[PDB]
C-alpha cells in the first residue's frame, strides 16, 4: 500500500469576502444602512530611508538623491470624520464530510483514509477543532490590522437556518484573548454548532459581523491587491486596495487564514501562540517553517505514518492532521 498519485480535498469552512462599512458606536444595532468605506487616492512623496549599498554612501550622491524625491499615488481607506466604528461583515458556511477527498487514484488508499478519519471521529468529535474555530471567530482575529489598537471590539454571530436568524451570539472580542483558549458557555454552544456542522449532522451558515471602535477619520486596512508594472501612463500608482463593487473589502483567503490560526502544537515553542495550519506550518511574516520535515511533525510524514503504517500520532498531532484535512489542498505527487 502506497499513497495515491492525485488526491485533493475541497475546503470546508468557506468564508465570503468581508465587506467594510462605517458608523457610530451605540448605533451598531441599527447598522444595516451604514455606508460603505470607499477607497480613495492620495499623493505620497517618498523620502530616502532604505539601507544604502555603501558603494553609494558618498555624501554628494546622497544629497543629490534627496534633492529630487520621487512621488506616488496610493490607494487609501479611512473612516469618515464623523464615524468612529468600522463594521466588517461576512458569511461562513460549515459543510461537513471532511475526510472524503474530491479526487483520488487508489481505491485502497481512500478506503484506508476514510476509515482512519472515521476512527478519529469515533475516538473524539470535532469538539477541539470547532472549539478553536469558535475562538478565532469570537476574538476578531479576522480583523488583521483593524483590531490592533482598537478601543473596543464586539462580534455578533448569527446562525441563519432558514432565511431568518436562528440564533445570536454576542462576544467581547478583546476579553477573549488571542493567546489562550478559555471556556465559556455561549462559546461552547457555538463550538457545538460548528462541530455539528463539521460532522455532517447539519448545514451551518453563519453571518459574522465585527465592530471595531477605532476613532474618527482613522485609517482602516482592507486587503491589498498586486501591481506588476507602474508607469507615467498611470498615476505612478504603487498601492492598490481590494474592493467589491464600491466598498473596501478583505479577501476571503485572509479571513480563512485568520480562522484556522489554531495550531498550538508546533514543536518549536508554544509561548509564541497559535499559527495557521499549513503543511510545513509556516508564517510569511516570520519567513520560517515550523514543523520542518527534518523533524517528524509536518503534515505529510504524519499522514503517511497514520494511514500507511498505522502509526497513529499523539492526539494533538491528530487534531493538526485533521485540521489540515479541513483546510483542504492538493496532496500528492
Amino acid at each position: 500500500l502506497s499513497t495515491a498519485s492525485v488526491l485533493a480535498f475541497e475546503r470546508k469552512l468557506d468564508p465570503s469576502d468581508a465587506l467594510m462599512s462605517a458608523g457610530a458606536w451605540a448605533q451598531r444595532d441599527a447598522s444595516q444602512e451604514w455606508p460603505a468605506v470607499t477607497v480613495r487616492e492620495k499623493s505620497v512623496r517618498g523620502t530616502i530611508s532604505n539601507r544604502l549599498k555603501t558603494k553609494d554612501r558618498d555624501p554628494a550622491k546622497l544629497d543629490a538623491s534627496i534633492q529630487s524625491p520621487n512621488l506616488q499615488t496610493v490607494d487609501v481607506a479611512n473612516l469618515p470624520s464623523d464615524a468612529d466604528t468600522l463594521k466588517v461583515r461576512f458569511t461562513l458556511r460549515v459543510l461537513g464530510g471532511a475526510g472524503t477527498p474530491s479526487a483520488c487514484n487508489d481505491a485502497a488508499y481512500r478506503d484506508k483514509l476514510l476509515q482512519t478519519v472515521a476512527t478519529y471521529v469515533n475516538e473524539q468529535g470535532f469538539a477541539e477543532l470547532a472549539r478553536r474555530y469558535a475562538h478565532n471567530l469570537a476574538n476578531a482575529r479576522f480583523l488583521w490590522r483593524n483590531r490592533v489598537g482598537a478601543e473596543a471590539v464586539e462580534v455578533r454571530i448569527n446562525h441563519i437556518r432558514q432565511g431568518e436568524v436562528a440564533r445570536t451570539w454576542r462576544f467581547d472580542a478583546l476579553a477573549i484573548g488571542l493567546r489562550d483558549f478559555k471556556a465559556d458557555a455561549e462559546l461552547d454552544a457555538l463550538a457545538e454548532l460548528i462541530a455539528s456542522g463539521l460532522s455532517g449532522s447539519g448545514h451551518v451558515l453563519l453571518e459574522v459581523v465585527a465592530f471595531a471602535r477605532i476613532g474618527d477619520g482613522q485609517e482602516v486596512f482592507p486587503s491589498q491587491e498586486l501591481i506588476l508594472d507602474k508607469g507615467d501612463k498611470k498615476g505612478q500608482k504603487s498601492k492598490t486596495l481590494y474592493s467589491v463593487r464600491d466598498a473596501a473589502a478583505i479577501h476571503s483567503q485572509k479571513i480563512g487564514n485568520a480562522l484556522r490560526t489554531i495550531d498550538t502544537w508546533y514543536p518549536d515553542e508554544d509561548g509564541l501562540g497559535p499559527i495557521a495550519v499549513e503543511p510545513y506550518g509556516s508564517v510569511t511574516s516570520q519567513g520560517k517553517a515550523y514543523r520542518q520535515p527534518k523533524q517528524k511533525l509536518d503534515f505529510y510524514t504524519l499522514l503517511d505514518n497514520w494511514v500507511l503504517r498505522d502509526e497513529a500520532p499523539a492526539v494533538e498531532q491528530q487534531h493538526y492532521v485533521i485540521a489540515n484535512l479541513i483546510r483542504g489542498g492538493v496532496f500528492g505527487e
Partner: protein
C-alpha cells in the same frame, strides 16, 4: 546586473518573487535620478529582452524631448 542605454539605467530589485509559479524580478527604468518605469519581468529573460521591454518608453521620451526642445523657425 544593471543595463545602461545611454543616460537610462534599468536595475533589478535585488530579490525576486514567484508570479504564476515562475520566478520574476522587478526591473526599474531610471533616467538619472528620475524613476521612469517599473516592470515585473521573469527570470530567464536575456538582457536584450529586458532592453526592448523598455525601448518603447525610451522612444516616447525621445519623441517628447525632440518636440519640446525643438528650435525656433523663421520664415
Amino acid at each position: 546586473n544593471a543595463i545602461h542605454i545611454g543616460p537610462f539605467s534599468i536595475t533589478p530589485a535585488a530579490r525576486g518573487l514567484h508570479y504564476g509559479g515562475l520566478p520574476h524580478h522587478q526591473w526599474t527604468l531610471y533616467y538619472g535620478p528620475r524613476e521612469m518605469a517599473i516592470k515585473t519581468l521573469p527570470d530567464s529573460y536575456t538582457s536584450s529582452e529586458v532592453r526592448d521591454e523598455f525601448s518603447d518608453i525610451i522612444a516616447e521620451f525621445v519623441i517628447d524631448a525632440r518636440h519640446r526642445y525643438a528650435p525656433d523657425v523663421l520664415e
